[PDB]
From a paper:
CRISPR-Cas are adaptive immune systems in bacteria and archaea that utilize CRISPR RNA-guided surveillance complexes to target complementary RNA or DNA for destruction. Recently, a variant type III-D system (III-Dv) was annotated with multiple gene fusions, suggesting its role as an evolutionary intermediate between the multi- and single-subunit type III effectors. The operon of the type III-Dv complex from Synechocystis sp. PCC6803 contains cas10, a cas7-cas5-cas11 fusion, a double cas7 fusion (cas7-2x), csx19, and an insertion-containing cas7 (cas7-insertion). Here, we present cryo-electron microscopy (cryo-EM) structures of the type III-Dv complex in four distinct states: bound to a crRNA (binary, surveillance complex), bound to an RNA non-self target in a pre-cleavage state, and bound to a self-target with coordinated magnesium in pre-cleavage and post-cleavage states.
We determined the cryo-EM structure of the type III-Dv surveillance complex containing the 37-nt crRNA at a global resolution of 2.5 Å, enabling us to fit and refine AlphaFold2-predicted models and rapidly generate a complete atomic model for the complex. Native mass-spectrometry revealed that a single copy of each subunit assembled into a 332 kDa complex, in contrast to type III-A and -B complexes which contain multiple copies of Cas7 and Cas11 subunits. Despite the different subunit stoichiometries compared with other type III complexes, our structure revealed that the fused subunits still arrange into a repeating backbone around the crRNA, a structural feature conserved across all class 1 CRISPR-Cas complexes. An uncharacterized domain comprising the N-terminal 112 residues of the Cas7-insertion subunit was absent from our map, likely due to flexibility. Csx19, a subunit unique to type III-D1 and III-Dv, contains multiple β-sheets and is nestled at the base of the effector between Cas5 and Cas10 subunits, making contacts with the crRNA, and contributing to the structural integrity of the complex. Indeed, affinity purification of a ΔCsx19 complex with an N-terminal Cas10 tag did not result in pulldown of the complex, indicating that assembly of Csx19 onto the type III-Dv complex is essential for complex assembly and stability. Our structure supports this evolutionary relationship, as the organization of the type III-D1 operon is maintained and subunits are physically fused together through flexible ~20-residue linker polypeptides. This is exemplified by the Cas7-Cas5-Cas11 subunit, which adopts a tortuous topology that places Cas7 in the body of the complex, Cas5 below it, and Cas11 back on top of Cas7. While most of the crRNA spacer is completely buried within the type III-Dv complex, six bases at the 3′ end are highly exposed in the insertion domain of the Cas7-insertion subunit.
Residue numbers in the entry:
A (entry chain A): 1 to 603, 615 to 616
B (entry chain C): -1 to 553
C (entry chain B): 9 to 193
D (entry chain D): 1 to 27, 32 to 209
Write the structure that this text describes.
């Protein structure tokens, strides 16, 4: 149940803070991707949660734990970070997703291009401490806070993912609580107790009728129902996979910031610069799981969803090859000059080189005579707190504040769903328009219920399959995705001779290292992936391998390389967990074959 | 006579030292990195060669013991027979010469195995190359080959990521991405699960106060009070500094040693390395005069993580990092001027007695990821090193950089970006305009006058920023600020406008607040921008941001 | 000093367990399925009470398994349709039908610990030889442990990392880690 | 749970300027505090410090009693204020506007206007009204003495607000004081908070 909104009307000047100032300002407000003030969904949940907990205390007659407090842990989810000891039940998620509150889209459209007005939405408020003895302004306690002008009407998208078996009376309890907690909210943001942030918070379609029903009925409520996961189901009735493959392009646009955990390290989560294919799996289940047994396809390898990487040249951006090197002072792909492919080019006389690492490159062809276009993903650090409820402040800076990197909104990513003709025939027989069903707005990743994760997915016309050139002189390999390989003891591993063995087995050839000294043959980096498994309820095993961008080139020592088999590997991937986009590989790519040292990059309402 | 050159080197110092935001572990990881190529090397050398390098070091508590080759035998003298000579030991690198291939390999096994046992998560490797001592420059050739072959292995080496792997039923570390392995305490005192990696770092933080005791007794004494104090500060800084010119020397050192004999290369190489450690630590003692002294605070608000040679890496209080690094870089140049072990090589390389260093400074909230902050300090020092292209020795062929210290910094305000390219892109409101004028040259205008790019260095002089910050901080005769915050903020807004709108606003405000004439940059006294390489650039936004970060305390 | 490893191919999980059962006696298993990560214990004979149904692949079934006891560890991962590679690790030289023996020299092995999720639950499960840890973060975790957990006990999975030369230059690494047993500390 | 509140007190009335008033804003002394609508207002930070300042003089700087009402960022037991002070728009009466006070220092030797000592100040005129905009969260079944003393001081006109307190300005008096009680510990009081506008207290008692 998305389509509920909260409206916040700001009735006094207001300050969602950033925990810091800037320059001449001692406190600055949070601004969205349009540089406009907004209330983050994490702030909005926290204020609304706090007020439903005020209502719960009254209904529980001051009992801090009880029936009605359990209803808050039902509606808003448990708070496992605060619980200690052997809590046996799995932590309940929220039933309510609350978005960020933004200004009306036409008003934000008017602000586009008008940087002076964008600043004018806020003004400086002075603050000064007075010496209690001398009664004078205590200098260096003079302070300027940015506050946003009152009158702002902000609106957040709300989704109530109520349990599908939930009793109609319990529906009215949830509606009653939320209406009641919304009503009791009077303040949000910084300096609430000194008159900032006075507001009205109203749900669409919750009124005093929902309040009055609870007042009439609260004495005969009970505990909310127990939480259980939606389990997978499998029929096993899928047809065996048959070629051809179909490649269905998926365009992902970020609509909110999206947190895609690279590493979780104390109170900070770092974010990837791509969307892993595993985040789209729940969308694949939801949209297509009625047309074939998705879980069976995953187990058999009849499904691949690639990583969504930044769109470059209208296609998925490809992780910068580690065989590319910049001139350390004046070159590199960021400087658009002095980029050497050390698979093909000697290191220049007297010039030291830095290896390329991050970023993505566009398309390239053997005689392009321009460096490939680079793509960059914009990430921002978002900072949040927990309030200790008795003191109504964070319990310290060290353990009161936490941060997420997120991919910011407005960025575009391309994934590919690959399905064999076997399943595509089955799907098309059940629904001819099935590609129309791939258009969806979904929330993905960490903290997806709050201010994070909102993405639009769009499906494109079936892409052409990869057509690698079969060359019998050399094999070139570009890791478009992290490659996870088992060692021969099935631990995960970092031994490239195992990948050499894997390829020459998979292609039925023999490979030899490129023996020149002025050139490099191998350019790998290690990668460790520390994910969760939400259905497990437990962490995923740590997956080790090679990061995207890792490159290697071999002489073929014997045997013809089958262009049809190279194409199939370029579709299915190599190694482990290719279904979710690991193992994606580029064979004999012209960019790894080029000499590039002489090339340069191309130039309101 | 013939032998092998062993290079043993630690890599991934970022991913080891900054992989947690816990000060004891940053401190502890930095100690393990230092110990890995000293104590663990010397204990390994003692085990492999039946020597007493560890006794000589631990009695001296310094690396100078290996200078005088009656004590660190000159094994190219056959009468002073020994299997081993140490050429270099320093943080993250060591070099040794050995006459036997087996003991070369055995040394690498010994030192690398001990890091696995005593320093879990440390990425250390080694390599050996042949050393043709009958060839003059044979050592210089061996050094070059060992280094470049080391890189080719790191492009294939199995990483440290493969060992402490998460099992779905293992709990996680409180402070890192690894599974928990045992328990420690947070600063509050609460028992917390930690990794083997985190546990061993914390254990080794107890060792750092011993190392730093010889530097300054004010540096570390109560890690818990220090760690608690840091996370009560508004700002930390990750300060990273690298020597300029040292790489330009070590690319070519046999050109500058004088006599081309291996004995002279080694002797000159070792003293150059040791003297720059001495210069580093002495320049540090001078620079820490910048930090004010709190009687309550037993310790200075600075943590020297790496402190020798080219590399200085410190975490300190962030409003004192700009002055500390200026004073460090100034003190470092003066030190290198005054070591004869450096003078003659810097003279022959660059025509001046001094070397210099660039620095990158990431100024961050205490909760900001030190991993990310250090990555930015790397990109800032890479930006600071652009002096190498702009400031050059006249009539040098090939063009050579002329010893010029520089700083690049960032203060990580909330929406400022967190990666270097995004940070700077956000400061380009139009493609003709840059709201930054970086890097800032720290070398004195007098010492640059013979360089190419002297006029460039003065436009990029740090003093120009410090003056503008002084004007922002200065007061009128009322004791009100000479520029109010309201006007400073209007100028911040104006800088994002079209240049004619920005210059129009600057005209209006400077009519009213005449101190802004000193912030003009066009020389026509009518713009905050000046044209630079076809871009309009300004120092003004740097001054507004850096306003509170020039604290000093050395007046 | 050798770490012996034994490898079989195109083998189903339940067959791999049975083919190893004389060594996996009382082993803790950790089974990986799309919906569940579950601990199991083999009988002192090495069987599992629903073995076929428990180790079946075809219905959201087991794609990976690890069985470990004091002497050895079996690892299995699905290659196709529920058939896959088994590797058994043992520091003892042992005979297996069908498994190809190999070995690795290792210089030394060092003890490691992993803290398990949770504190001892307020009551153990009704099954004998099972205990319940719980943490608000994950809820319950039933573990096949026969010691009745004291309040403020913590359980650690103990392991041994084997260190060997990876390079002809003499660079060491830990080449593998074998899981041993649950231990209460 | 939230912060445990026994009774929430909405404490309201009309504060009248008994002298002119000046509360300054960032943008000599001709800038009066204006909200985002550009209306003149009393910032709740400035009213709180007036009220907190008075109580501090009352309680002989007994910091503990002050921090128990007004909060403390330092003490691990305290945190947020239990008094909320809202911002209050100033209603300047009809046919009135902001005035400007012009003045000068007088040289003590010559008895004449000292050169460089002219000053100008904008002032909200006398008789201007703004709301007393207070909320108090009680954690016990009463109302604090020092808070009752504060309300008596406000009704007495004893509290000064804004600049130039010693030199003409800042006197305010409270009228129409109303106290509304919400027993947020109890269902009847929470639903009263949601629906019924609260249990009236006679202040005169």
């Amino acid at each position: 149940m998305r389509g509920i909104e909260i409206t916040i009307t700001m009735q006094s000047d207001w300050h969602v803070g950033t925990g810091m100032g800037r320059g001449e300002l001692d406190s600055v407000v949070q601004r969205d991707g349009d540089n406009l003030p907004y209330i983050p969904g994490k702030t909005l949940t926290g204020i609304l949660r706090d007020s439903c907990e005020q209502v719960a205390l009254g209904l529980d007659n001051g009992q801090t734990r009880g029936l009605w407090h359990g209803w808050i842990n039902f509606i808003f989810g448990d708070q496992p970070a605060l619980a200690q000891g052997a809590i046996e039940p799995e932590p309940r998620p929220a039933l309510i997703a609350i978005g960020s509150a933004h200004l009306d889209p036409k008003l934000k459209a008017a602000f586009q291009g008008k940087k002076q007005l964008q600043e004018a939405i806020a003004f400086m408020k002075p603050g000064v401490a007075i010496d209690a003895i001398t009664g004078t302004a205590k200098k260096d306690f003079l302070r300027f806070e940015e506050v946003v002008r009152l009158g702002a009407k902000l609106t957040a998208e709300v989704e109530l993912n109520l349990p599908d078996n939930l009793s109609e009376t319990n529906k009215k309890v949830i509606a009653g609580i939320l209406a009641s907690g919304a009503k009791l909210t009077e303040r949000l943001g910084g300096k609430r107790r000194r008159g900032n942030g006075r507001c009205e918070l109203k749900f669409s379609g919750y009124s005093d009728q929902q309040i009055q029903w609870l007042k009439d009925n609260y004495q005969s409520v009970d505990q909310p129902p127990k939480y259980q996961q939606n389990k997978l189901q499998s029929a096993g009735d899928n047809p065996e996979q048959q070629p051809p493959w179909h490649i269905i392009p998926l365009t992902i646009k970020t609509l909110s910031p999206v947190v895609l955990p690279a590493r979780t390290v104390g109170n900070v989560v770092e974010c990837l610069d791509y969307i892993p294919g595993r985040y789209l799996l729940g969308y694949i289940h939801k949209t297509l799981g009625e047309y074939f047994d998705v879980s069976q396809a995953i187990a058999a390898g009849d499904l691949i969803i690639t990583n969504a990487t930044i769109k470059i040249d209208g296609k998925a951006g490809r992780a910068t090859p580690f065989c590319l090197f910049g001139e350390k002072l004046d070159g590199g792909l960021g400087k658009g000059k002095g980029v050497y492919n050390r698979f093909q080019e000697s290191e220049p006389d007297g010039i030291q080189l830095k290896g390329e690492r991050g970023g993505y490159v566009g398309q390239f062809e053997q005689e392009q005579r321009n460096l490939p276009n680079t793509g960059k993903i914009n990430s921002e650090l978002f900072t949040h707190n927990t309030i200790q409820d008795d003191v109504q402040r964070p319990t310290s800076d060290v353990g009161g504040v936490y941060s997420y990197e997120a991919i910011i909104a407005g960025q575009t990513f391309v994934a590919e769903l690959r399905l064999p003709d076997s399943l595509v025939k089955q799907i098309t027989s059940k629904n001819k328009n099935w590609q129309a069903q791939l258009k969806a707005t979904i929330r993905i990743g960490q903290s997806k219920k709050d201010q994070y994760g909102k993405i639009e997915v769009t499906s494109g016309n079936s892409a052409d399959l990869p057509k690698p050139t079969g060359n019998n002189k050399t094999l070139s390999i570009w890791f478009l995705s992290d490659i996870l390989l088992r060692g021969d003891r099935l631990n995960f591993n970092a031994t490239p001779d195992d990948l050499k063995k894997y390829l020459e087995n998979a292609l039925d050839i023999k490979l030899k290292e490129r023996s020149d000294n002025d050139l490099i043959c191998i350019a790998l980096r290690s990668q460790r992936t520390e994910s969760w498994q939400v259905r497990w309820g437990l962490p995923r095993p740590s997956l080790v391998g090679w990061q995207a961008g890792s490159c290697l080139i071999y002489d073929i020592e014997s045997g013809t390389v089958n262009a049809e088999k190279l194409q199939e590997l370029m579709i299915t991937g190599i190694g482990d967990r290719c279904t979710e986009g690991y193992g994606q590989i580029g064979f004999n790519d012209p960019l790894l074959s080029a000499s590039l040292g002489k090339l340069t990059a191309k130039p309101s309402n | 006579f013939q032998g092998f050159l062993v290079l043993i080197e630690t890599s991934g110092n970022q991913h080891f030292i900054f992989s947690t935001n816990k000060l004891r572990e940053n401190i502890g990881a930095s100690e393990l990195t230092y110990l890995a190529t000293t104590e663990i090397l010397f204990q390994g050398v003692d085990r492999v060669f039946q020597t007493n390098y560890y006794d000589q070091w631990s009695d001296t508590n310094s690396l100078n013991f290996l200078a005088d080759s009656k004590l660190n035998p000159a094994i190219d003298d056959p009468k002073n027979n020994a299997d081993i000579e140490i050429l270099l030991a320093t943080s993250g690198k060591a070099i040794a010469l050995v006459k036997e291939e087996g003991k070369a390999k055995q040394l690498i096994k010994e030192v690398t195995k001990q890091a696995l046992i005593n320093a879990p998560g440390l990425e250390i490797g080694g390599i050996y190359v042949n050393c043709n001592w009958q060839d003059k420059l044979g050592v210089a050739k061996a050094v070059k080959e060992a280094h470049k072959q080391f890189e080719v292995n790191r492009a294939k080496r199995a990483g440290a990521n493969g060992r402490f792997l998460r099992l779905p039923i293992a709990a996680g570390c409180s402070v890192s991405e690894l599974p928990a392995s045992d328990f420690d305490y947070n600063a509050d005192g609460d028992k917390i699960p930690v990794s083997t990696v985190s546990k061993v770092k914390r254990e080794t933080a107890k060792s750092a106060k011993k190392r730093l005791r010889s530097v300054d007794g004010r540096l570390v004494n109560d890690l818990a009070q220090l760690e608690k104090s840091f996370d009560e500060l508004d700002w930390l800084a990750v300060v990273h500094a690298d020597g300029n010119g040292l790489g330009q020397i070590l690319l070519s050192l046999e050109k500058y040693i004088g006599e081309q004999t291996n004995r002279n290369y080694i002797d000159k190489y070792r003293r150059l390395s040791l003297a720059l450690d001495n210069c580093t630590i002495n320049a540090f003692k001078m620079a820490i005069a910048v930090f004010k002294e709190d009687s309550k605070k037993i310790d200075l608000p600075i943590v020297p993580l790496i402190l020798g040679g080219d590399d200085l890496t410190v975490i300190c209080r962030g409003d004192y990092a700009l002055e500390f690094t200026r004073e460090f870089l100034e003190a470092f140049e003066g030190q290198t001027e005054t070591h004869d072990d450096i003078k003659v090589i810097a003279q022959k390389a660059f025509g001046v007695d001094r070397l210099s260093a660039c620095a990158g400074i990431s100024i961050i909230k205490p909760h900001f990821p030190f991993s990310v902050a250090y990555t930015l300090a790397e990109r800032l020092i890479k930006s600071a090193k652009e002096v190498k292209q702009k400031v050059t020795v006249t009539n040098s062929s090939p063009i050579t950089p002329f010893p010029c210290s520089a700083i690049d910094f960032h203060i990580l305000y909330d929406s400022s970006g967190i990666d270097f390219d995004r940070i700077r892109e956000k400061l380009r409101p139009e493609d003709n305009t840059e709201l930054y004028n970086r890097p800032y040259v720290v070398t004195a205008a007098e010492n640059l006058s013979q360089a190419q790019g002297y006029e460039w260095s003065q436009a990029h002089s740090l003093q120009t920023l410090a003056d503008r910050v002084s004007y922002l901080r200065s007061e009128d005769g009322e004791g009100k600020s000479a520029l109010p915050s309201s006007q400073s903020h209007a100028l911040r807004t104006a800088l994002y406008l079209e240049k004619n709108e920005a210059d129009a606003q600057y005209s209006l405000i400077s009519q009213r607040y005449k101190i802004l004439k000193n912030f003009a940059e066009d020389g026509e006294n009518k713009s905050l921008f000046h044209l630079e390489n076809g871009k309009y650039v300004t120092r003004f936004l740097d001054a507004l941001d850096a306003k509170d970060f020039f604290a000093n305390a050395n007046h | 000093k050798n770490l012996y490893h034994y490898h079989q191919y195109e083998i189903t999980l339940e067959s791999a367990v049975d083919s190893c059962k004389n060594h996996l006696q009382a082993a803790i298993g950790l089974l990986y399925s799309p919906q569940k990560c579950e601990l199991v214990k083999l009988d002192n004979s090495g069987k599992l009470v629903d073995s076929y149904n428990r180790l079946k692949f075809n219905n959201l079934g087991v794609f990976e398994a690890r069985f470990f006891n004091l002497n050895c560890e079996l690892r299995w991962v699905n290659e196709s349709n529920g058939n896959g590679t088994a590797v058994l690790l043992s520091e003892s030289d042992i005979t297996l039908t069908g498994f190809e023996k190999g070995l690795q020299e290792f210089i030394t092995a060092i003890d490691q610990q992993y803290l398990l999720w949770g504190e001892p639950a307020k009551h153990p499960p009704n099954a004998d030889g099972w205990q319940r840890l719980a943490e608000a973060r994950i809820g319950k975790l039933d573990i096949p442990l026969d010691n009745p957990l004291k309040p403020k006990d913590r359980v650690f999975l103990t392991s041994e990392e084997y260190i060997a030369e990876v390079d002809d230059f003499g660079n060491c690494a830990v080449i593998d880690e074998r899981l041993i047993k649950l231990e209460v500390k | 749970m939230a912060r445990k509140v026994t009774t929430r007190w909405k404490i309201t009335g009309t504060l009248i300027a008994e002298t002119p008033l000046h509360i300054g804003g960032v943008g000599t002394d001709l800038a009066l505090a204006v909200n985002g609508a550009g209306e003149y207002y009393v910032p709740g930070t400035s009213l709180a410090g007036a009220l907190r300042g008075w109580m501090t003089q009352l309680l002989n700087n007994d910091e503990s009693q002050i921090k128990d009402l007004w909060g403390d960022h330092l003490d691990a037991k305290r945190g947020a204020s239990f008094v909320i002070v809202d911002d209050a728009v100033i209603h300047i009466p009809n046919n009135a506007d902001v005035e400007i006070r012009e003045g000068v220092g007088i040289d003590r030797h010559f008895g004449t206007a000292a050169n460089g000592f002219k000053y100008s100040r904008a002032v909200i005129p006398k008789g201007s009204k703004f709301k007393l905009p207070l909320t108090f969260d009680s954690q016990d079944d009463g109302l604090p003495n020092a808070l009752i003393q504060l309300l008596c001081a406000l009704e007495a006109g004893d509290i000064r607000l804004g600049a130039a307190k010693t030199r003409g300005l800042g006197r305010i008096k409270l009228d129409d004081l109303k106290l509304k009680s919400f027993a947020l510990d109890k269902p009847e009081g929470i639903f009263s908070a949601l629906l019924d506008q609260g249990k009236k207290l006679d202040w005169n008692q």
